[PDB]
Amino acid sequence: ISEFGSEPIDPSKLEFARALYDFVPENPEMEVALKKGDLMAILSKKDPLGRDSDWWKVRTKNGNIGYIPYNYIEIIKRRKKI
Amino acid sequence: ISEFGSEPIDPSKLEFARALYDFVPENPEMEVALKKGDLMAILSKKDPLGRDSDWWKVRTKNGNIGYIPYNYIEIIKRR
Amino acid sequence: SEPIDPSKLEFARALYDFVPENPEMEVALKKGDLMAILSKKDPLGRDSDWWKVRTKNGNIGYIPYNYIEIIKR
Amino acid sequence: SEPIDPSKLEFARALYDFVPEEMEVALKKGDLMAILSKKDPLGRDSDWWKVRTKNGNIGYIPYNYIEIIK
Numbered sequence: 001i002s003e004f005g006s007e008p009i010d011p012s013k014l015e016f017a018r019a020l021y022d023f024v025p026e027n028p029e030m031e032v033a034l035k036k037g038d039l040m041a042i043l044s045k046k047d048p049l050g051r052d053s054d055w056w057k058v059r060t061k062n063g064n065i066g067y068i069p070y071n072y073i074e075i076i077k078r079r080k081k082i
Numbered sequence: 083i084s085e086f087g088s089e090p091i092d093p094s095k096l097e098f099a100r101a102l103y104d105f106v107p108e109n110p111e112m113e114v115a116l117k118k119g120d121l122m123a124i125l126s127k128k129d130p131l132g133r134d135s136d137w138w139k140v141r142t143k144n145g146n147i148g149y150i151p152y153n154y155i156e157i158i159k160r161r
Numbered sequence: 162s163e164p165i166d167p168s169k170l171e172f173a174r175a176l177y178d179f180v181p182e183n184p185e186m187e188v189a190l191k192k193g194d195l196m197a198i199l200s201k202k203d204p205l206g207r208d209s210d211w212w213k214v215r216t217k218n219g220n221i222g223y224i225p226y227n228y229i230e231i232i233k234r
Numbered sequence: 235s236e237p238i239d240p241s242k243l244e245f246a247r248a249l250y251d252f253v254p255e256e257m258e259v260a261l262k263k264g265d266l267m268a269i270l271s272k273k274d275p276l277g278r279d280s281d282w283w284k285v286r287t288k289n290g291n292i293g294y295i296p297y298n299y300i301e302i303i304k
């Protein structure tokens with residue numbers, strides 16, 4: 001495949017988020033570190049096995065890709081309500 | 083007054099809390115730092131003016147005293 | 162100290178007074194003071210919450226970043 | 235580095251492999267080490283800790299890569 005799969009991605013379904021709290025990975029190999037107010041792209045809401053998980057894989061401003069607890073972030077809403 | 087007022091206190095009313103997330107004060111003079119997991123004793127839920135607030139005054143493990151957002155902590159429940 | 166990149170050179174204003182506890186590496190600041198940020202890194206290279214600054218009086222030293230505010234255009 | 239207090243002397247095991255940042259120490263899942271200090275070259279609370287490898291190597295490592303034993 002490609003970095004983001006094989007089929008086309010609809011840019012309208014791409015979600016963004018802002019970290020609500022600082023976060024230090026308990027697992028430095030699977031997770032990413034966050035500072036309150038960081039923005040990121042939500043790449044997937046499934047674990048490595050393909051299961052629905054409360055840990056979401058994201059891509060931070062740094063370019064780092066790892067998981068973060070869903071309740072530690074805020075999905076930016078449409079138009080302006082961030 | 084004493085450190086905690088003048089009227090006797092009811093023990094089964096004192097609440098303790100556990101930090102849910104790390105917290106860095108935006109106001110170092112009014113707030114206390116925190117690390118996820120930290121224990122504390124809740125002194126009061128009133129702001130410095132006596133009003134209700136989302137900022138509670140706590141006594142940390144260290145002995146520090148300051149305010150922390152209420153949604154950043156978890157009040158420990160019973161037996 | 163170290164020659165600063167003209168990109169990351171920022172000036173800060175102190176929001177609260179800071180009384181050094183360890184004047185060895187800590188600098189004194191009074192609410193409202195102006196200072197240049199020398200580095201956002203710790204003694205041993207690594208992003209820390211203690212920034213190295215330069216006082217208006219030329220004093221170098223570390224300070225907690227939440228005591229200051231970057232003066233933005 | 236310097237004399238440690240018999241109260242704060244702890245041993246840790248490496249939870250995940252760690253690759254040096256030559257100014258710090260290298261780790262491999264499973265390795266043992268003694269935690270000399272949970273501070274920095276300044277003395278303030280830090281995420282990085284100073285340790286001594288089983289091979290006598292000293293240097294800093296991210297505290298979330300290790301686990302204090304017992």
